[PDB]
Symmetry: C3
Subunit: 128 residues, 3 copies
């Protein structure tokens, strides 16, 4: 199973695994964020995911410790269909304190996972 | 694979975007106003009987923070197959980072289903 | 399918068997957190998961109203790799109000999941 991945540019740090571990993604540019402010931290990457698969994106264990940001959407769902040449991943960050992220910083991690199977949604007037 | 769904009332907007594999959006069952640093359970006006052996996972949409200034306090909501009774309506536990207003009908979060953990024996052991 | 689990001390309340359900985990000691402050809440447990699996840890839906805390990493990911006698799970809590969590309190919950299959990251210039 392969993932095709476009980098924003040559300065981005490429990421190498087939170990099953979640893969760290990194900030594409310096972002500074005041306490109680919001910013998209661009991750400088676009990917074509395997057919029938999602990416899930959550912070790293140490993200809060080292940057004082929480992830606004809790968990990011990157769908297989987000595979365009301008479809760059971002990390939506709310700073609970003054913070600076530097280009290259590892700020979140992801894995892939089979989309849910197909499903008939059937309205009913009463449940058991 | 089918899910039964019951709606609080005819007012509610059927979520008739059954899966092409994608997560599915849920909507505020009523007008809800939440002030800065206030918490509210936002009712989603749906009860469901998930497939045997499954659970549902709920998370915010990508734009939920931009548009309503709320985060989901439980990060990823877990809904077990057993939450299927006739009064088991889904909610969105929302904490507000600014003064905000959700209107009835609004898409505020999204779900998919996924198979439960297989059974597991838990052994206590002195060391590892 | 088997998980080997090691409690911190005798004091800790062992957990029941279960069925596929997320298992609740308990705070290992009383912890007080002021508004707008962060603290790791020990869950007094370390575990050897199955070869090829990870654990996901998230709050109960009631953690906020009962205890006033969110989990700053959203969902903790614990790898098969974290299986040593000192590898004790924690709940990273940030308090949005003053709060005292009390030993024994069930504050978050977990399950296991097969890890991602092996994949190739093939760099490309266009998509
Ligand atoms: O944390 C995230 C979350 C989403 N994303 C990406 C994936 C998503 O496809 C895109 C946002 O554009 P839309 O809001 O239109 N996508 P959406 O999730 O709304 O898809 P849909 O409308 O199909 O439900 O941002 C991230 O990069 N990081
Ligand atoms: O975001 C959510 C999360 C859960 N739920 C529902 C489904 C689930 O069966 C029920 C309880 O979930 P939790 O286990 O996370 N909270 P708690 O453990 O307090 O409830 P219970 O004691 O029933 O397990 O609430 C929601 O409607 N929205
Ligand atoms: O909420 C959490 C999250 C992680 N953990 C555990 C598992 C993890 O291995 C450990 C943190 O160690 P590291 O800082 O080395 N992070 P991790 O092992 O995930 O990094 P890598 O991606 O290199 O494995 O804490 C918790 O107890 N609670
Ligand atoms: Mg529970």
């Amino acid at each position: 199973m392969q993932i095709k991945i476009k980098y924003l540019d040559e300065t981005q740090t490429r990421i190498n695994m087939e170990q099953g571990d979640w893969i760290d993604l990194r900030a594409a540019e310096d972002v500074a964020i005041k306490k109680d402010e919001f910013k998209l931290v661009p991750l400088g990457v676009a990917m074509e995911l395997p057919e029938g698969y999602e990416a899930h994106v959550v912070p790293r264990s140490s993200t809060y410790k080292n940057f004082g940001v929480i992830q606004t959407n809790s968990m990011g769902v990157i769908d297989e269909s987000y595979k365009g040449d301008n479809d760059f991943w971002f990390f939506p960050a709310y700073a609970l304190r003054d913070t600076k992220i530097k280009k290259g910083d590892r700020i979140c991690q992801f894995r892939i996972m089979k989309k849910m199977p197909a499903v008939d949604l059937i309205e009913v007037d009463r449940l058991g």
